[PDB]
């Protein structure tokens, strides 16, 4: 936790001496920093005195001269396509199921229902004329319950937080801390 | 203006050299001339510099005042406005200003003498000085701009030494020497208009009681433009005047109803909008101011001025000849008076003054 | 959240007659504030003038047949008038639109370069 | 003569004068590119006519440094290997080939390689 | 289609009376085997007689006043490129794309 | 009383070669995917009147109807339950000068309520109306000014439609494709009239055409499919 921290602990130039003890006593908060970088540490040896010796990271399966097909790791060009999803093709999946959940006769008799569904078919149609437990089970969920809208991250949640955790204002100040939980 | 200002885009000049135009005519066009504006600084200066530069031409601009140079820049792009300090009694600074110009227009001149030049000196030393330099540079045109009442024999030292000058130019740079003779210039911030403008303006009655013939000052620096990419108008004189003559008494009324300093019956009178003074005061207060005061006030000479109206040569030129007609004064006279208003501030209404509005106002003040 | 002064609620009309009126309407607004357009802007010219100004720029849509190009044209229109009446327009844009203005000959232009 | 000042050459026919302002650079004289405009031509403009022409930028002719570097003769080798003598801060590797008897030079730097068999026949 | 939207679009006059564009798909490069941009249909307009271009005298920079000069409008299909040209009322004309004559090639040409 | 340390100094851990996975990063919207797809599709059989077609990308749910139920379909993803989109945070055009309708109309909505975001789009021409979305979202107020003044779309019903990222009087719309990206006019000073005016554009260097230079290859291929086995149409068992 970030509590206070001691002067000295703290890279800035501070008092010595007697200068130390009175500037104990007259300053309110005495373990407060003065904010004049340390001349002795701050940026000493400035980045063009640097003695380190860069060498490029390469990691070993998408950067070795072994193993490392590149269309292994081509992800651009696998990029996921657009598919935009017409009543038409909805009413096919209500009506004939998904490959996941195949609802669709066999042979030459499943094929005649498939033409159905490549030209115009109005989902108001299909939703007319239809079982109404598909419509329980595919179009809604959990029995008929609505779809709620989808979250972008399920772990996003919060709890309350008093000062004695966080270390902000008090509980009298017209605001409050929310943590991960 | 225009947006192309040349009537063909290959133009040969005296000299030999042949200049062609590149681009539609804007900031980004060239015209392949390259000029030299004297006394660029001044009140015709800037508009003279303004319609050269705004089509690409070069302009040279010798100069003494350094903040005065500053606001001709804008007028051109990058390259364009080129700056050279300058003094008359420095023949190198002149020599260097005119050493790559095809055009050198003389607009130095002066009506007052001052501790260090006199009006010979400015009249016709400088301009002499400019003509011969210009010569000796292989320049193809000059332009001189002379007064309105020239005249060696003339009785006021400005008048003559604005004739001398003419003779001068023409002896030195060559017949090819075309002369300019303005009538006074109505613009904003002209010193013919501020004159009138003034508030307390001492001994109205004699000054004001000269009668010209006014010209609006952007049509004078057009006419400039016109005679430095014509060369059909070398060697030739031009007297640039309007149509309609006017006393200054009679402008100075008309200013007087336009500003609405008569909207209180007292404050014209007790503000001093009138100065009556006997004419042997304002030469003693003329000749004491001219070696007293630091800034040029009224001289004895435009004391003398005041008795002489403008006279018109008829052999010269005018607009006619170079196509243009003059501007009437009571169209521009409400917008150049216009800053000079008391209050408007479009408390009621504004009083818009328009051609046939002033005509009817000149009715007005000559109605007894 | 409270709309400016002169703020009209956009409307696609759907009646050819019913344009015709607020065209008309709309007219007459222009007129009216010829004066105000003079003062609060400081014009060199009568209010005379700017009527006239404006009587031209409407004749130039006059013979406009579609009707989905005249809900625009007056929306525009609309528009302009609020920009006009707020003195919302520099003085510079207002001075421009005032200082708009035979034709040269073939050999007029080729001796120049035409275009 | 200002027919030295305002051609391009492959060698200037005088000796460089390092206080001349009209050469193209103050070691060469004449321009070494057709399309390269001679200084003469550009500082005789309107905008030098008060300007100190001393004052301006004259970097020295890269041409005529270039040929004072020495050939690099390679022994028992028909290919040499250039850099840019720098390394990392060089310019790209390339190899050039020695078959032919005269020298040719990097792509890049310029410099000149060539085979020692070649020596006698290229100096004379 | 009918409908002038060139009186709505606030372009200038000028691109109308004064300005010619061109209809075309871009021929395949003499220099590459690729044919990708040969697959759409572009719209540009054809230089200006003069001051399409001229050189700055200062630096030697390409001036130009044609405001259309940069601008290629890029198409899918050659009816919708006509469509949008009549729609903004611009006078245009159609380069009809070179079409390549189909011959079979097999390596036992090489003998035979 | 101590010295601090010299950061420095400060021994470092040493590495051998490393390591790192190699997958789809599309692979991590798995879950992302099904679930927007059956949302999605709630939504078209709530609304069969209303909804064209629906697509998913990813995490992108994006919703496609007509101008005439653009209000309808706004009001029901504001108030229904499941769907509690209350904020609008941006309303957008582009230009598709090919097609029949220009512009394509877009309307980011979202959801607080249950952490989503859900997309609609409509289509406009020059002259079609779009009816204004203000009334339901008063944030889209500013962002139908910037979609006219930058394109020109008829918005229906905007208390206060004008201009608001180009001058005054400014003419034409500048995000249109024909729209030259320089403009047609520029400004400067003239001294003659003492303020500033506008004149025909003209560049000292005209702007260089570096596009041109394009590859006359196809780079991307047909890419990879990621469509949820639960939403691809059923294959036929084979003969007998
Ligand atoms: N109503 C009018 O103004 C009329 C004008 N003219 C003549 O037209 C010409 C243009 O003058 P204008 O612009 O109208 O008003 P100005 O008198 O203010 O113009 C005078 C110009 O000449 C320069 N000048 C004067 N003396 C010198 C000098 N010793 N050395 C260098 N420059 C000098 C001035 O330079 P700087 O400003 O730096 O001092 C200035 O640019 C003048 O010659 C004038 O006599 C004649 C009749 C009517
Ligand atoms: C305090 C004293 C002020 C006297 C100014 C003066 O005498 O100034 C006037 C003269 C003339 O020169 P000018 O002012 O440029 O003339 C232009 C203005 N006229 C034509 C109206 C005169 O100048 C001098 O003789 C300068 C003397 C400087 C003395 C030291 C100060
Ligand atoms: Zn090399």
Redesign the pocket.
Known sequence: SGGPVPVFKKYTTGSKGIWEKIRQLLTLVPNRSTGNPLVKNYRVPPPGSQTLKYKDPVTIPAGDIVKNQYYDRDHRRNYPRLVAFDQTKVSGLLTLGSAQNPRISVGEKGQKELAVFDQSVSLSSTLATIDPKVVKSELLAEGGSPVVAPSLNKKMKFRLTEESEHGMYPEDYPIRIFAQN | VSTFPLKSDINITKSGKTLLSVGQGGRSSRTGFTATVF???????RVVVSKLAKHGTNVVVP???DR?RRQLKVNGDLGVVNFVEF??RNLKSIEDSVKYSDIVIN?????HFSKN?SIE??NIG?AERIAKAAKEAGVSRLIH?S??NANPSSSSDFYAT?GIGEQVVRDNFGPDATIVR????YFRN???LNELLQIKALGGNVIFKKEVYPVHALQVGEAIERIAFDDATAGQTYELFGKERYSKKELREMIKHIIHIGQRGYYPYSAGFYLPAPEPFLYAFALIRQYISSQPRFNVDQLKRSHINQEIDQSAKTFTDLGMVPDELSEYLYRYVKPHISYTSQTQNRTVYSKEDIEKLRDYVNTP | TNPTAFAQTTRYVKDSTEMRTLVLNLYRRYLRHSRGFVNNYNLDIPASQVRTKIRQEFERQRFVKDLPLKNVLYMKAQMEFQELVNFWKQQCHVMQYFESIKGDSFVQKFLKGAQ | STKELTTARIKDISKPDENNLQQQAPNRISPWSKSQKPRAEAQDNVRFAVKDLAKQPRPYAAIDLIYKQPIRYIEHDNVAVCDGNGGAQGHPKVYINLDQNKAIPCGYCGLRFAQAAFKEDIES | TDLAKELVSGAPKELITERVARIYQEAKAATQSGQHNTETWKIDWDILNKGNRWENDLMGYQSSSDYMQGTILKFDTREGAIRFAKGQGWDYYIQEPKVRRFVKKDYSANFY | EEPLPVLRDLPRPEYGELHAPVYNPAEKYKEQIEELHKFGRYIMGCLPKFVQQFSVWKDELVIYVAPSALTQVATFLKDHTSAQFKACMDVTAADYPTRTNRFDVVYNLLSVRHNSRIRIKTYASEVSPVPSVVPLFQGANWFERETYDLFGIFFEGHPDLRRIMTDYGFQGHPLRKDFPTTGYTEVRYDAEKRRVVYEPLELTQAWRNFTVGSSVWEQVGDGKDFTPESFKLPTPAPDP
């Open positions: 006394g660029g600084t001044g009140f015709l200066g100069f003494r005042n005065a003094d008359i607009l130095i001149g002066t009506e030049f000196d400015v400088a701009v007064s309105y604005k303005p009538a006074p210039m002209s010193p013919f």
